[PDB]
Design an enzyme around this catalytic site. Structure first.
Site, PDB file in Angstrom:
ATOM      1  N   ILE A  12       0.863  -1.193   0.000  1.00  0.00           N
ATOM      2  CA  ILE A  12       0.000   0.000   0.000  1.00  0.00           C
ATOM      3  C   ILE A  12       0.890   1.230   0.000  1.00  0.00           C
ATOM      4  O   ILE A  12       1.774   1.364   0.888  1.00  0.00           O
ATOM      5  CB  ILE A  12      -0.963  -0.025   1.190  1.00  0.00           C
ATOM      6  N   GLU A  47      -2.168  -8.510   3.436  1.00  0.00           N
ATOM      7  CA  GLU A  47      -1.667  -9.762   4.047  1.00  0.00           C
ATOM      8  C   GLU A  47      -2.639 -10.908   3.780  1.00  0.00           C
ATOM      9  O   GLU A  47      -2.194 -12.061   3.624  1.00  0.00           O
ATOM     10  CB  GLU A  47      -1.412  -9.636   5.549  1.00  0.00           C
ATOM     11  N   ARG A  54      -1.999 -12.288   0.443  1.00  0.00           N
ATOM     12  CA  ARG A  54      -0.759 -13.097   0.372  1.00  0.00           C
ATOM     13  C   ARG A  54      -0.961 -14.495   0.953  1.00  0.00           C
ATOM     14  O   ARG A  54      -0.241 -15.417   0.465  1.00  0.00           O
ATOM     15  CB  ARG A  54       0.356 -12.381   1.115  1.00  0.00           C
TER      16      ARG A  54
END
Ligand SMILES: O=c1[nH]c(=O)c2ncn([C@@H]3O[C@H](CO)[C@@H](O)[C@H]3O)c2[nH]1
Length: 244
Positions: free
Chosen positions: A71, A160, A163
């Site tokens: 970000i 996250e 991911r």
């Protein structure tokens, strides 16, 4: 672009947002069936826009570097906001140009720096969909202290989760009740670059990690990751940071 609305959100609609976010990240190939993020993208194409809406329907747009799911900054009404780091000033050349003013936050996007600015480490900040509601509300109006904690929630509940399937599932469990991240959540966030590196290196080493990775598992126990047959590689990690 991708969107997520907290109004009427349930585990299903959050999962659809994280699927949308992963699918908006380009890849030319897969390594051990995991998309490999590009080494580089030139121009405005480097940045994905995420439209996030709080329970009351107020919105921010977040800019994400598609090479590393970082970000860079966000737009709230007529003000852009960028992290105090070179990658984010570079992003401000391409995104949210039309904002009336551009604020540089008084910190980089590093977890260590954000935790110092917030006054608490990740381990003590509850995350979940209610926390994301609160983070969007915080970011609508500048407050650099409040924004640091909101940004820690935002990073964990978007990038996250993209991911790691386990982190997506942890936020789904927190659809209606925030809870500090599990020890495995923090472990995975900390290990993404290492795991990405060992999985790429495992091609040429018979699927064997050149350097084993120490994680915490879903039960809070130590696990040492030595090769690509590990469930962290076969089920959990969804995106690889390019070793370049
Ligand atoms: O803005 C961000 N988006 C992320 O996904 C993310 N993941 C980690 N970080 C932290 O930012 C630093 C890079 O400046 C890393 O060292 C991570 O601490 C992130 N920052």
């Amino acid at each position: 672009d991708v969107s997520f609305r907290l109004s009427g959100a349930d585990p299903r609609s959050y999962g659809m947002f994280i699927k949308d976010l992963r699918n908006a990240l380009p890849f030319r190939e897969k390594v051990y069936n995991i998309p490999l993020l590009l080494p580089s993208v030139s121009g405005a194409g480097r940045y994905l826009l995420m439209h996030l809406f709080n329970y009351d329907g107020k919105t921010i747009t977040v800019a994400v570097d598609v090479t590393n799911v970082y970000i860079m900054g966000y737009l709230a009404d007529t003000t852009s906001y960028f992290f105090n780091e070179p990658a984010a000033e570079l992003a401000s050349q391409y995104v949210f140009r039309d904002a009336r003013r551009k604020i540089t936050l008084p910190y980089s996007g590093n977890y260590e720096r954000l935790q110092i600015a917030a006054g608490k480490p990740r381990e003590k900040i509850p995350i979940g969909l209610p926390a994301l509601d609160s983070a969007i509300s915080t970011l609508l109006h500048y407050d650099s202290t409040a924004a640091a904690g909101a940004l820690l929630v935002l990073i964990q509940t978007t990038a996250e989760a993209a991911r790691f399937k386990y982190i997506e599932q942890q936020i789904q469990e927190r659809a209606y009740r925030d809870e500090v991240p599990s020890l495995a959540t923090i472990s995975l966030e900390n290990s993404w670059s290492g795991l990405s590196k060992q999985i790429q290196l495992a091609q040429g080493n018979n699927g064997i990690f050149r350097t084993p990775i120490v994680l915490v598992d879903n039960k809070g126990n130590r696990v040492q990751i030595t090769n690509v047959t590990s469930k962290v590689v076969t089920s959990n990690i969804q995106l690889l940071l390019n070793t370049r």
